[PDB]
């Protein structure tokens, strides 16, 4: 049980030191994450609200 | 929404309910469906009550079977001014009789009827028009007409059937009229047919509607002429003119979705609402309910605590103001059921979590009651006793030579944030002065 | 500013403006931050930080003097602190909003006797304890105006305070349980009072005085008041000092108040309100000897627990439940160790229970009348050192070590193979246990305590051998199932292998060196999976490979700046695809090509702190459908709201949950019921077991008042005794009743009762040592509750299309006379035709028996029924007899192995004749097996029915009597004469076996009756019947079957997979498919075309019905729980949309469902909305549309009744493997979906989602290779997975808490340090 998701954790299953471009790649990772996660008529709004 | 005021029972039991199906008429008669002793039929015997005394007057076992057949169907009728009951025998015989009597009638004809694993198959029904009796029905081939002259000399005279349905399927138009029909329906998924009967019953005459997605478990008919349908999909409302076509509209009310099963559409027929407007009730899942006929669709269910709320409803209900009458039959009882229609009302509630907000204020207020205290106080005297740990006096044998040793910590402090401080005290026997 | 906390306020500059363009290169940019006062008076910073805004944020401050961490900072801003003692010992810890986690306390060795001669105690004791609202006051000049009320003057420091005169309490406490605690110093005379309630304790220098007597104390020491209405407590440094009982009403409004005469300096102070208490008494190796803890206002419970001389654990009592209401008066000992809760405790005298077996004495023996003497479960250990079992005893007399049901091992096992080929005494520990019903099993252990094999047989079925190899690091490398070995030896001997080898029936792994994780994981249903590691040692990527070595689809995650997983997809393979999964293993960059990848994003970009690090923002995206859901976990990542965000609407349908001590006390349903919103509180006593479910509702005053859904009521041992459902106008209890092992054997409420068999009657099989359910017997009586309408049998049930209208009316008719149905149309009796001799022959026709017996127990509704169980080698449930009438009393017996010595033949002629007999009769044909030639005779409806006039005259006589012809034609007169004509000539032909033959008439006088009762009656003959013949090694059924439904299932040649199915007597081959990794993708017996499934979930996402009839659409979140159902038409028209708002645990809460009947005008549709009110065993109703509806459950959690205002709506009856025997229901409102044992029945397809797995009931497999391997096979089930009966996430969670609380405190104290144990066995050698 955890706040982040381990690879475990998935369904889809069957650190001394950093170099500086690979902390340019996380955080190209990071960005590009953010980048992309950013009475019928109640029926309706929840019809909406569940999958589109 | 229909509120139950009250249920009245009758005096006289029907016997016990194992493998026996209900059938409850009221006297039909010519010039109305007007109120009258009713006579049910309960397994193979049929009973006779009064209204005014609402007791049990006979009970004759005229009957050959106990599940309504589709071979076999029953009614009363008045003719010649005499009140007649008329039945279906296991040998294709209408067996015609008075209320006392059994005048066997004379026949021009004997059906034969058998069952298909193809589920279509030969039934035959008991209509009434112009003020004869016509027992119509589809043997196995066809589907041909006949009308009892009556008892007597009376015989069964058959008028001319052409039609031979490419897909089979036999229910009457039921409404609520002086005539049991006007209508004869043939019904398939694609469409229904239906033909006019006539002072001769079954004409050529024929106006086919189109209905699709529907097989048409039930259809009824309006004295103001529009034509309902009641369908697995839902109740769909036509109007008959020159072509019979034309969709009025829609209400998805008695359906398979909402637990109209086979056994509950076929006890739902018509009534007046008395401003020459006619609205449909019957008996399903939830039980007795009742729905005006209208383009906004709104049916009534009642929820009330009782046990006579599922009752099989007779048909000729009756309407009087905001309260109806209906016949029911309950667990082979009889109960007369006063009820009430209610709209319902609900009023909304609304600023639910409206209140006021505002900002956060802080201010750092100290306390004058309250003074910080210059340089410490106290200091606690910790015990030796409690930080000792007793894991150097568990094993202290030593096993090779059979001495003794142990070394205890004599101070050990390293709750010191710089660095920690720590003297050993050792035990180890040796000859060494 | 973007928060404030108490006194202080937390303010921050995101330096959004400028970034890096492209990220190529750095910037090498100068930051310059300044902290300043604006105006003249002063500012005080405690603390500064500066970084980036992704990095997570945990610094972390120590204390100047006493050097430990006792304060911590989490990214969003909040402090949550630690309270350390004064030997540096954790002692509690403070959450970020202010009230504690945890208190603990331990004997300090101060307060201790030299010297002392006591028989019973506790060498130390530790006390324990969590509260509802709890705080510790810093007594800052801040914060304490608006804390305390303070009459005099008073001078403070950091967490002290050198207080004059009085301060009170503003929060005016009304709950059960109150308590503080501090640390004073008294000096000269100076005097302190704790005033609680009515109780008020004075501490002097010298002593503590209270009311009843007064204890020493030192001059310095922590005091721990504990006051409930009937109780106080008063500890002192660690030692309990007084307890004495209290007759104070309840606490309403009660007030704690210092007041001190003369100079003290209180130290800390942590006050306590709703708090959860836990006593333990521990021996010389701190092991528990005694537990008390708090259940209830004036409710203890007790548990003790003795031990051997050398150490080790010998018994353990139960729970027992001792009220301090009635105490008695003799003593008052409520936390304080108990001399008199066992008398037979010392060894020397006084009847040891070891010897003699039963106690004498409890205090309040809460058990005797159920555990009968004997409430412990003890244990007697081999001449050894060490701790090796040779005899357990459970509780019961029955269970105990001188009862019959007592566990015995043996160390030496009979087999010569397992003692050769395991070299005994060598580090191969084997131990072997056997059952009365004639089974074996005997498990191996290594060094390490891994099972190396196991081996078990049974009586007449083949042995199972299955086997581990591990590793150097102890890793599994490989297993082989009993298959292997079964195809190997095919016979006696057996060889258990002791290496890795290769063989298509292992199961491999090949972990890297030095023991990484698994590199290749090999089954022989799926395939081989590979996995692909990084430089830092991140699980990167995950490749499948067919069965022919090609790849068929690689999982990729992309991994975050902390180090956390941002994102996961799969992509097909391909060559290019393994090439970028080469070259990107290097580059850490993504793969290109993804279609489906679901991202997860928990807070860090906010701009609203308290959500930064806490909220798990998750966006889902299949191809072109997208969904988005965020959820916010508070400090211990338990859940207060989950949201459902989507990009229309700014607001989000959202459930809240207000909970404390990590359990749920309330749930905001987004639930509308009477236009008000439905808001559940869950109240729970002091043990933390669920007590109560209310629900909310408003009155407008501004009064909220709670209207009880369900009052619950527990044991003493955790397990639910009685549901109490006291909503609406029907009030009703289901009362569990337990027996002496501890298993449930009665469910009894006014509807429907059942009752449960464990050792008394069994269907072949004697009471195993498993504890497995015997038989179940129902008496439903909820008949007249009902519409009562629909329950009578007519004679349309049996009519269908294949058989003739007007034969049902005589076969009904047939039927009642008979007394099959009591006149109400409840059948009576199971109809059985080889049992009644005179019927139609329309009736006695084989098919025609087949139908109207089946339209007969579906449509029927029996007042009594049940099954008899008989269990297998696997553990599984192979047989099952069903008794519809009252043969519940006196049911047959299995045909193998029937007691015919009682038949008057001696033993050595009884073993030929059963020989003969046993080789002669093919049992399925019935009592036609007892003539020869029956194959002949079958030409005529005569013919097929002759056997039994002919076997009824061959012995009784009467029956027909020679004009049996009359009887049998009932619904014809012309076949009457065809049966006189062909009577005689069948007659006559029949001849008898050439064994029974071979037999003499002393035998024959009665014997054959009886033979052709159970022979006529035999397990194959019911329609309620559940059976598996063959069986695989791994548990594969070679043939099932339910009711007359016959499922022949040939399995594939290496794998656990189906290869062919035949459907019945039919024979026709209806085909199955599986997939690359063993999910079945076609199963035409179910009527599937196809099954599709979701890459991301691994669940099912497409079902197409046979013809294309219908087609199920679902989707899901990323945990795999359903999120919404579609099911369309033949014509693409969605015929019902279904949405699931699931709990974190799979639960659902709120469920919409639209249904359009007409498809082509959607704008009328039928709209219901329904809410579960869950509980400890299953779900205790559901409102839907302004009502709500009770459910019932039996064992097993299965769905049986369905109740509202006191009249079952519907009803369901099931039989085992979970395939449902009939339903009651007609309201479509009152239906539910949970069916059996709570998992949602797909109608249309006729398949459970069993625990995130499609399930059959037809065939009793599941569709999907299990995630954790529980048997040989993948696809076996059970057959019958009864529940806990212990509440759960009450009770045993609760319990957990405090068993880690003990860990720490043990840690702490350094009980898990070097040596530290009295015991060689836990020496360091
Ligand atoms: C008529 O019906 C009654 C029940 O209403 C039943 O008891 C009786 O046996 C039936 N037969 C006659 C002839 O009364």
Redesign the pocket.
């Given at each position: 049980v955890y706040n982040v998701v381990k690879p475990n954790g998935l369904k889809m299953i069957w650190m001394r030191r950093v170099k500086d471009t690979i902390i340019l790649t996380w955080y190209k990772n990071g960005q590009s994450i953010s980048k992309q996660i950013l009475m019928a008529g109640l029926m309706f709004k929840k019809n909406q609200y569940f999958f589109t | 929404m229909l509120r139950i005021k009250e249920v009245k029972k009758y005096n006289?039991?029907?016997?016990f309910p194992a493998g026996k199906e209900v059938r409850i008429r009221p006297l039909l008669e010519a010039g109305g469906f007007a109120r009258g002793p009713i006579y049910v039929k309960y397994g193979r015997?049929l009973?006779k009550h009064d209204p005014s005394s609402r007791s049990?007057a006979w009970?004759?076992?005229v009957f050959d079977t106990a599940l309504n057949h589709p071979t076999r169907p029953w009614t009363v009728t008045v003719v010649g001014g005499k009140k007649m009951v008329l039945g279906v025998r296991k040998e294709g015989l209408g067996f015609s009789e008075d209320d006392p009597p059994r005048s066997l009638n004379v026949k021009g004809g004997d059906d034969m009827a058998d069952e298909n694993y193809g589920g279509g198959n030969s039934t035959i029904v008991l209509v009434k028009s112009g003020g004869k009796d016509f027992a119509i029905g589809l043997d196995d081939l066809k589907e041909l007409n006949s009308f009892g002259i009556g008892a007597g000399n009376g015989k069964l005279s058959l008028a001319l059937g052409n039609p031979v349905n490419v897909l089979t399927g036999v229910v009457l138009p039921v409404e609520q009229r002086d005539g049991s029909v006007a209508y004869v329906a043939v019904n398939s998924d694609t469409k229904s047919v239906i033909y006019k009967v006539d002072a001769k019953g079954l004409q050529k005459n024929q106006k086919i509607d189109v209905n699709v997605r529907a097989s048409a478990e039930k259809i009824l008919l309006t004295k103001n002429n529009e034509l309902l349908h009641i369908s697995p999909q839902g109740l769909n409302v036509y109007s008959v003119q020159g072509s019979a076509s034309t969709f009025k509209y829609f209400c998805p009310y008695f359906s398979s979705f909402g637990g109209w099963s086979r056994r509950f559409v076929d006890t739902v027929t018509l009534m007046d609402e008395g401003g020459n407007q006619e609205a449909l009730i019957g008996t399903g899942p939830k039980g007795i309910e009742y729905m005006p006929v209208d383009e906004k669709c709104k049916n009534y269910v009642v929820e009330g605590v009782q046990d006579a709320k599922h009752a099989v409803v007779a048909p000729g209900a009756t309407k009087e103001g905001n309260d109806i009458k209906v016949l029911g039959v309950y667990n082979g009882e009889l109960c007369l059921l006063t009820l009430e229609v209610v709209d319902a009302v609900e009023p909304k509630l609304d600023q639910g979590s409206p209140a006021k907000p505002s900002a956060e204020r802080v201010k750092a207020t100290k306390s004058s009651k309250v003074t910080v205290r210059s340089g410490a106080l106290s200091k606690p005297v910790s015990w030796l006793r409690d930080s000792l740990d007793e894991a150097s006096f568990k094993n202290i044998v030593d096993k090779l030579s059979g001495k003794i040793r142990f070394s205890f910590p004599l101070v050990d402090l390293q709750g010191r944030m710089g660095l920690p401080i720590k003297l050993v005290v050792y035990y180890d026997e040796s000859d060494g002065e | 500013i973007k928060q404030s906390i108490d006194e202080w306020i937390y303010v921050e500059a995101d330096s959004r403006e400028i970034v890096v363009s492209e990220s190529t290169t750095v910037k090498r940019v100068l930051f310059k931050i300044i902290v300043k006062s604006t105006g003249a008076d002063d500012v005080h910073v405690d603390h500064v930080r500066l970084s980036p805004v992704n990095f997570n944020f945990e610094g972390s401050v120590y204390d100047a003097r006493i050097g430990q961490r006792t304060a911590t900072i989490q990214t969003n801003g909040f402090v949550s602190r630690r309270l350390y003692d004064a030997y540096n010992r954790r002692i509690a810890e403070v959450d970020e909003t202010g009230n504690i986690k945890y208190l603990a306390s331990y004997s300090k060795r101060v307060g201790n006797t030299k010297d002392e001669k006591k028989r019973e105690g506790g060498y130390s004791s530790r006390i324990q304890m969590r509260a509802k609202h709890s705080w510790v006051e810093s007594f800052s000049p801040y914060t304490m105006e608006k804390r305390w009320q303070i009459g005099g003057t008073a001078t403070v420091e950091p967490n002290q305070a050198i207080l004059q005169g009085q301060i009170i309490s503003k929060e005016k406490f009304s709950s059960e349980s109150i308590c503080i605690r501090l640390v004073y110093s008294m000096s000269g005379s100076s005097q302190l009072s704790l005033t609680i309630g009515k109780t008020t304790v004075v501490v002097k220098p010298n002593a503590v005085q209270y009311k009843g007597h007064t204890a020493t104390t030192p001059s310095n020491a922590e005091l721990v008041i504990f006051a409930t209405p009937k109780l106080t407590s008063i500890w002192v440094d660690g030692h309990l000092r007084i307890e004495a009982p209290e007759t104070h009403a309840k606490f309403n409004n009660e007030a704690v108040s210092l007041q001190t005469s003369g100079p003290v300096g209180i130290k800390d102070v942590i006050v306590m309100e709703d708090a959860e208490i836990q006593v333990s008494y521990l021996n010389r190796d701190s092991k528990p000897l005694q537990e008390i803890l708090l259940l209830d206002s004036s409710n203890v419970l007790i548990r003790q627990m003795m031990y051997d001389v050398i150490g080790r654990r010998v018994a353990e009592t139960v729970w027992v439940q001792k009220s301090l209401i009635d105490g008695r008066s003799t003593a008052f000992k409520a936390f304080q160790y108990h001399d008199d809760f066992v008398s037979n405790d010392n060894p020397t005298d006084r009847n040891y229970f070891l010897n003699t077996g039963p106690m004498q004495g409890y205090v309040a023996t809460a058990t005797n009348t159920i555990y009968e003497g004997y409430p412990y479960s003890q244990t007697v250990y081999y001449n050894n050192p060490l701790e090796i079992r040779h005899k357990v005893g459970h509780p019961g007399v029955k269970n105990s070590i001188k009862g019959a049901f007592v566990h015995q091992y043996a160390i030496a096992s009979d087999l010569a193979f397992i003692q050769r080929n395991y070299p005994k005494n060598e580090g191969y520990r084997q131990e072997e246990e056997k059952s009365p019903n004639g089974k074996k099993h005997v498990v191996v252990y290594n060094r390490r305590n891994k099972k190396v094999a196991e081996y078990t047989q049974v009586k007449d079925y083949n042995n199972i051998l299955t086997t581990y190899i591990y590793d150097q690091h102890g890793n599994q490398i490989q297993m082989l199932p009993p298959s292997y070995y079964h195809e190997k030896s095919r016979s006696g001997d057996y060889q258990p292998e002791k290496q890795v080898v290769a063989s298509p029936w292992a199961v491999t792994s090949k972990y890297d060196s030095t023991g990484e994780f698994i590199t290749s994981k090999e089954t022989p249903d799926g395939g081989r999976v590979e996995f692909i590691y990084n430089e830092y040692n991140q699980l990167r990527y995950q490749i499948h490979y067919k069965e022919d070595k090609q790849a068929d689809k690689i999982v990729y995650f992309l991994y975050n700046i902390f180090g956390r997983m941002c994102e996961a997809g799969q992509v097909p393979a391909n060559p290019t695809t393994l090439q970028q999964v080469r070259e990107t293993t290097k580059s850490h960059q993504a793969i290109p090509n993804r279609d489906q990848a679901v991202y997860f994003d928990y807070g860090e970009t906010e701009s609203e702190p308290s959500l930064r690090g806490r909220i798990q923002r998750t966006v889902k995206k299949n191809k072109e459908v997208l969904f988005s859901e965020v959820m916010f976990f508070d400090e211990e990542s338990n859940i207060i709201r989950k949201s459902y965000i989507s990009p229309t609407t700014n607001e989000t349908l959202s459930l809240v949950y207000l909970q404390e001590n990590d359990k749920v006390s309330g749930i905001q349903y987004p639930f509308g019921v009477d236009g008000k919103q439905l808001i559940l509180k869950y109240k729970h006593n002091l043990r933390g077991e669920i007590v109560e479910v209310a629900r909310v509702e408003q009155k407008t005053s501004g009064q909220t008042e709670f209207i009880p859904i369900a009052g619950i009521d527990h044991d003493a041992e955790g397990k639910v005794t009685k549901i109490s459902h006291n909503y609406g106008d029907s009030k009703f209890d289901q009362t569990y009743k337990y027996v002496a092992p501890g298993y449930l054997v009665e469910i009894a409420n006014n509807f429907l009762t059942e009752k449960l068999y464990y050792t008394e009657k069994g269907y072949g099989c004697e009471p195993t040592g498993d504890g497995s359910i015997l038989r179940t017997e129902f008496k439903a009586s909820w008949h007249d509750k009902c519409d009562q309408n629909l329950i009578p049998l007519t004679a349309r049930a049996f009519v269908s299309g294949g058989i003739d209208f007007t034969t049902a009316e005589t076969c009904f008719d047939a039927l009642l006379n008979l007394g099959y149905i009591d006149t109400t149309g409840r059948p009576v009796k199971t109809f059985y035709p080889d049992l009644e001799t005179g019927l139609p022959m329309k009736c006695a026709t084989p098919s025609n028996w087949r139908y109207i017996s089946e339209k007969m127990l579906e449509q029927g509704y029996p007042e009594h029924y049940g099954h008899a169980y008989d269990y297998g080698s696997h553990g599984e449930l192979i047989a099952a007899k069903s008794f519809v009438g009252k043969e519940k009393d006196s049911l047959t017996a299995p045909l193998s192995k029937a007691s015919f010595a009682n038949a008057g033949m001696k033993s050595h002629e009884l073993d030929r004749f059963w020989d003969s007999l046993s080789r002669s009769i093919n049992k399925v044909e019935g009592t036609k097996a007892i003539f020869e030639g029956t194959q002949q005779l079958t030409t005529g409806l005569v013919g097929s029915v002759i056997h039994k006039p002919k076997l009824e005259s061959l012995l009784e006589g009467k029956g027909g009597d020679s004009s049996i012809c009359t009887p049998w034609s009932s619904g014809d007169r012309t076949e009457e004469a065809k049966c006189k004509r062909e009577y005689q000539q069948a007659f006559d032909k029949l001849k008898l076996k050439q064994v029974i033959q071979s037999l003499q008439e002393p035998v024959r006088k009665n014997v054959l009756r009886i033979l052709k009762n159970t022979l006529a009656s035999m397990l194959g003959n019911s329609p309620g019947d559940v059976e598996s013949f063959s069986i695989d090694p791994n548990g594969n059924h070679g043939v099932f079957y339910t009711g007359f439904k016959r499922f022949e299932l040939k399995y594939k040649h290496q794998k656990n997979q189906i290869a062919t199915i035949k459907e019945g007597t039919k024979q026709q081959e209806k085909m199955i498919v599986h997939d690359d990794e063993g999910n079945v993708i076609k199963a035409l017996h179910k009527k599937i075309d196809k099954i599709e499934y979701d890459p991301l979930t691994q669940r099912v996402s497409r079902i197409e019905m046979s013809d294309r009839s219908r087609t199920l659409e679902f989707g899901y979140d990323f945990r795999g729980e359903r999120t919404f159902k579609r099911v369309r038409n033949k014509d693409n028209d969605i015929i019902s949309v279904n949405y699931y708002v699931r709990d974190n645990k799979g639960n659902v809460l709120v469920e919409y469902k639209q249904e359009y009947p007409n498809p082509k005008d959607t704008n009328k549709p039928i709209n219901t909305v329904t809410a579960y009110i869950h509980g400890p065993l299953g779900l205790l109703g559901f409102f839907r549309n302004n009502k709500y509806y009770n459910v019932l459950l039996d064992h097993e959690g299965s769905t049986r009744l369905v109740i509202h205002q006191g009249k079952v709506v519907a009803a369901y009856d099931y039989l085992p493997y979970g395939q449902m025997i009939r339903k009651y229901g007609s309201n479509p409102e009152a239906h539910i979906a949970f069916r059996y044992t709570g998992q949602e029945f797909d109608e249309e397809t006729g398949l459970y989602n069993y625990h995130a797995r499609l399930y059959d009931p037809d065939i009793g497999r599941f569709f999907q290779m299990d995630p954790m391997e529980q048997y040989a096979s993948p696809y076996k089930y059970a057959g019958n997975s009864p529940v806990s009966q212990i509440d759960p996430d009450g009770q045993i969670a609760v319990t957990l808490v405090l068993m880690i609380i003990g860990a720490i405190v043990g840690a702490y104290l350094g009980a898990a340090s070097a040596n530290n144990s009295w015991n060689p066995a836990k020496w360091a050698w």
């Amino acid at each position: 049980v955890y706040n982040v998701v381990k690879p475990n954790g998935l369904k889809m299953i069957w650190m001394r030191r950093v170099k500086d471009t690979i902390i340019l790649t996380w955080y190209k990772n990071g960005q590009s994450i953010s980048k992309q996660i950013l009475m019928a008529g109640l029926m309706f709004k929840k019809n909406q609200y569940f999958f589109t | 929404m229909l509120r139950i005021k009250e249920v009245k029972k009758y005096n006289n039991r029907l016997g016990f309910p194992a493998g026996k199906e209900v059938r409850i008429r009221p006297l039909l008669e010519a010039g109305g469906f007007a109120r009258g002793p009713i006579y049910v039929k309960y397994g193979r015997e049929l009973s006779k009550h009064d209204p005014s005394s609402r007791s049990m007057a006979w009970n004759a076992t005229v009957f050959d079977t106990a599940l309504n057949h589709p071979t076999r169907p029953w009614t009363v009728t008045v003719v010649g001014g005499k009140k007649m009951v008329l039945g279906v025998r296991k040998e294709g015989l209408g067996f015609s009789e008075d209320d006392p009597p059994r005048s066997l009638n004379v026949k021009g004809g004997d059906d034969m009827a058998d069952e298909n694993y193809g589920g279509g198959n030969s039934t035959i029904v008991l209509v009434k028009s112009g003020g004869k009796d016509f027992a119509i029905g589809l043997d196995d081939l066809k589907e041909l007409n006949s009308f009892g002259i009556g008892a007597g000399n009376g015989k069964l005279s058959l008028a001319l059937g052409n039609p031979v349905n490419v897909l089979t399927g036999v229910v009457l138009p039921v409404e609520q009229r002086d005539g049991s029909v006007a209508y004869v329906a043939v019904n398939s998924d694609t469409k229904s047919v239906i033909y006019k009967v006539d002072a001769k019953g079954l004409q050529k005459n024929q106006k086919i509607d189109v209905n699709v997605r529907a097989s048409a478990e039930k259809i009824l008919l309006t004295k103001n002429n529009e034509l309902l349908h009641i369908s697995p999909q839902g109740l769909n409302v036509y109007s008959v003119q020159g072509s019979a076509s034309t969709f009025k509209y829609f209400c998805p009310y008695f359906s398979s979705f909402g637990g109209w099963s086979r056994r509950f559409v076929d006890t739902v027929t018509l009534m007046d609402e008395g401003g020459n407007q006619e609205a449909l009730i019957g008996t399903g899942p939830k039980g007795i309910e009742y729905m005006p006929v209208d383009e906004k669709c709104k049916n009534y269910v009642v929820e009330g605590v009782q046990d006579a709320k599922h009752a099989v409803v007779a048909p000729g209900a009756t309407k009087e103001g905001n309260d109806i009458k209906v016949l029911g039959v309950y667990n082979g009882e009889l109960c007369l059921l006063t009820l009430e229609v209610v709209d319902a009302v609900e009023p909304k509630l609304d600023q639910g979590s409206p209140a006021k907000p505002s900002a956060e204020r802080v201010k750092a207020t100290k306390s004058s009651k309250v003074t910080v205290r210059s340089g410490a106080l106290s200091k606690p005297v910790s015990w030796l006793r409690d930080s000792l740990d007793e894991a150097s006096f568990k094993n202290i044998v030593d096993k090779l030579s059979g001495k003794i040793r142990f070394s205890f910590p004599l101070v050990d402090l390293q709750g010191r944030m710089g660095l920690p401080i720590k003297l050993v005290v050792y035990y180890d026997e040796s000859d060494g002065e | 500013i973007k928060q404030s906390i108490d006194e202080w306020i937390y303010v921050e500059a995101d330096s959004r403006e400028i970034v890096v363009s492209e990220s190529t290169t750095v910037k090498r940019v100068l930051f310059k931050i300044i902290v300043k006062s604006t105006g003249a008076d002063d500012v005080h910073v405690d603390h500064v930080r500066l970084s980036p805004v992704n990095f997570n944020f945990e610094g972390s401050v120590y204390d100047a003097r006493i050097g430990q961490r006792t304060a911590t900072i989490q990214t969003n801003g909040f402090v949550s602190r630690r309270l350390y003692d004064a030997y540096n010992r954790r002692i509690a810890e403070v959450d970020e909003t202010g009230n504690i986690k945890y208190l603990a306390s331990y004997s300090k060795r101060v307060g201790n006797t030299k010297d002392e001669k006591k028989r019973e105690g506790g060498y130390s004791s530790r006390i324990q304890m969590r509260a509802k609202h709890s705080w510790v006051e810093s007594f800052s000049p801040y914060t304490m105006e608006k804390r305390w009320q303070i009459g005099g003057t008073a001078t403070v420091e950091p967490n002290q305070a050198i207080l004059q005169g009085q301060i009170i309490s503003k929060e005016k406490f009304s709950s059960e349980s109150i308590c503080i605690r501090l640390v004073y110093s008294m000096s000269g005379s100076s005097q302190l009072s704790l005033t609680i309630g009515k109780t008020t304790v004075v501490v002097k220098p010298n002593a503590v005085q209270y009311k009843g007597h007064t204890a020493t104390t030192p001059s310095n020491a922590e005091l721990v008041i504990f006051a409930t209405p009937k109780l106080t407590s008063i500890w002192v440094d660690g030692h309990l000092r007084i307890e004495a009982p209290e007759t104070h009403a309840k606490f309403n409004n009660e007030a704690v108040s210092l007041q001190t005469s003369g100079p003290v300096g209180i130290k800390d102070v942590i006050v306590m309100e709703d708090a959860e208490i836990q006593v333990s008494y521990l021996n010389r190796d701190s092991k528990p000897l005694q537990e008390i803890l708090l259940l209830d206002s004036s409710n203890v419970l007790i548990r003790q627990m003795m031990y051997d001389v050398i150490g080790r654990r010998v018994a353990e009592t139960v729970w027992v439940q001792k009220s301090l209401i009635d105490g008695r008066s003799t003593a008052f000992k409520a936390f304080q160790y108990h001399d008199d809760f066992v008398s037979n405790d010392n060894p020397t005298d006084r009847n040891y229970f070891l010897n003699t077996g039963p106690m004498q004495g409890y205090v309040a023996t809460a058990t005797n009348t159920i555990y009968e003497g004997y409430p412990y479960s003890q244990t007697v250990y081999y001449n050894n050192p060490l701790e090796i079992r040779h005899k357990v005893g459970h509780p019961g007399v029955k269970n105990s070590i001188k009862g019959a049901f007592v566990h015995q091992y043996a160390i030496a096992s009979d087999l010569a193979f397992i003692q050769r080929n395991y070299p005994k005494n060598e580090g191969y520990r084997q131990e072997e246990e056997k059952s009365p019903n004639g089974k074996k099993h005997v498990v191996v252990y290594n060094r390490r305590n891994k099972k190396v094999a196991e081996y078990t047989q049974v009586k007449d079925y083949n042995n199972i051998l299955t086997t581990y190899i591990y590793d150097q690091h102890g890793n599994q490398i490989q297993m082989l199932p009993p298959s292997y070995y079964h195809e190997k030896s095919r016979s006696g001997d057996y060889q258990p292998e002791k290496q890795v080898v290769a063989s298509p029936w292992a199961v491999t792994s090949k972990y890297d060196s030095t023991g990484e994780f698994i590199t290749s994981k090999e089954t022989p249903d799926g395939g081989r999976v590979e996995f692909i590691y990084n430089e830092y040692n991140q699980l990167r990527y995950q490749i499948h490979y067919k069965e022919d070595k090609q790849a068929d689809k690689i999982v990729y995650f992309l991994y975050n700046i902390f180090g956390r997983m941002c994102e996961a997809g799969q992509v097909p393979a391909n060559p290019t695809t393994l090439q970028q999964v080469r070259e990107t293993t290097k580059s850490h960059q993504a793969i290109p090509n993804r279609d489906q990848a679901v991202y997860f994003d928990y807070g860090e970009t906010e701009s609203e702190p308290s959500l930064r690090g806490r909220i798990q923002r998750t966006v889902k995206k299949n191809k072109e459908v997208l969904f988005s859901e965020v959820m916010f976990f508070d400090e211990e990542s338990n859940i207060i709201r989950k949201s459902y965000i989507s990009p229309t609407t700014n607001e989000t349908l959202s459930l809240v949950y207000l909970q404390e001590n990590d359990k749920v006390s309330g749930i905001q349903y987004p639930f509308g019921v009477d236009g008000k919103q439905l808001i559940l509180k869950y109240k729970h006593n002091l043990r933390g077991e669920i007590v109560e479910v209310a629900r909310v509702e408003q009155k407008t005053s501004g009064q909220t008042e709670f209207i009880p859904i369900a009052g619950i009521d527990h044991d003493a041992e955790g397990k639910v005794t009685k549901i109490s459902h006291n909503y609406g106008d029907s009030k009703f209890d289901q009362t569990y009743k337990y027996v002496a092992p501890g298993y449930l054997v009665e469910i009894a409420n006014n509807f429907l009762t059942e009752k449960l068999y464990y050792t008394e009657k069994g269907y072949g099989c004697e009471p195993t040592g498993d504890g497995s359910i015997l038989r179940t017997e129902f008496k439903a009586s909820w008949h007249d509750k009902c519409d009562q309408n629909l329950i009578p049998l007519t004679a349309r049930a049996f009519v269908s299309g294949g058989i003739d209208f007007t034969t049902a009316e005589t076969c009904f008719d047939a039927l009642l006379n008979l007394g099959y149905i009591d006149t109400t149309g409840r059948p009576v009796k199971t109809f059985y035709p080889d049992l009644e001799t005179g019927l139609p022959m329309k009736c006695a026709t084989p098919s025609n028996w087949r139908y109207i017996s089946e339209k007969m127990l579906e449509q029927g509704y029996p007042e009594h029924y049940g099954h008899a169980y008989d269990y297998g080698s696997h553990g599984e449930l192979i047989a099952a007899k069903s008794f519809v009438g009252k043969e519940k009393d006196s049911l047959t017996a299995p045909l193998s192995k029937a007691s015919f010595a009682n038949a008057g033949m001696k033993s050595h002629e009884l073993d030929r004749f059963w020989d003969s007999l046993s080789r002669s009769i093919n049992k399925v044909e019935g009592t036609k097996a007892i003539f020869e030639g029956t194959q002949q005779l079958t030409t005529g409806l005569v013919g097929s029915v002759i056997h039994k006039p002919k076997l009824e005259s061959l012995l009784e006589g009467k029956g027909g009597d020679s004009s049996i012809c009359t009887p049998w034609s009932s619904g014809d007169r012309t076949e009457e004469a065809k049966c006189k004509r062909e009577y005689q000539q069948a007659f006559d032909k029949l001849k008898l076996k050439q064994v029974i033959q071979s037999l003499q008439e002393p035998v024959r006088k009665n014997v054959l009756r009886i033979l052709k009762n159970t022979l006529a009656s035999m397990l194959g003959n019911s329609p309620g019947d559940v059976e598996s013949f063959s069986i695989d090694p791994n548990g594969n059924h070679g043939v099932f079957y339910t009711g007359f439904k016959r499922f022949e299932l040939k399995y594939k040649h290496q794998k656990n997979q189906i290869a062919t199915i035949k459907e019945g007597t039919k024979q026709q081959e209806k085909m199955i498919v599986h997939d690359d990794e063993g999910n079945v993708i076609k199963a035409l017996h179910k009527k599937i075309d196809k099954i599709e499934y979701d890459p991301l979930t691994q669940r099912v996402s497409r079902i197409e019905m046979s013809d294309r009839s219908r087609t199920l659409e679902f989707g899901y979140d990323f945990r795999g729980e359903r999120t919404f159902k579609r099911v369309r038409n033949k014509d693409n028209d969605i015929i019902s949309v279904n949405y699931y708002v699931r709990d974190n645990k799979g639960n659902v809460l709120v469920e919409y469902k639209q249904e359009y009947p007409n498809p082509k005008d959607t704008n009328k549709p039928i709209n219901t909305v329904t809410a579960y009110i869950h509980g400890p065993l299953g779900l205790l109703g559901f409102f839907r549309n302004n009502k709500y509806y009770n459910v019932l459950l039996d064992h097993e959690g299965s769905t049986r009744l369905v109740i509202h205002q006191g009249k079952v709506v519907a009803a369901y009856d099931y039989l085992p493997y979970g395939q449902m025997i009939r339903k009651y229901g007609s309201n479509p409102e009152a239906h539910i979906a949970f069916r059996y044992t709570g998992q949602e029945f797909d109608e249309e397809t006729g398949l459970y989602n069993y625990h995130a797995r499609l399930y059959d009931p037809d065939i009793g497999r599941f569709f999907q290779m299990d995630p954790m391997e529980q048997y040989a096979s993948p696809y076996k089930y059970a057959g019958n997975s009864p529940v806990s009966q212990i509440d759960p996430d009450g009770q045993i969670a609760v319990t957990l808490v405090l068993m880690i609380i003990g860990a720490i405190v043990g840690a702490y104290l350094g009980a898990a340090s070097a040596n530290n144990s009295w015991n060689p066995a836990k020496w360091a050698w």
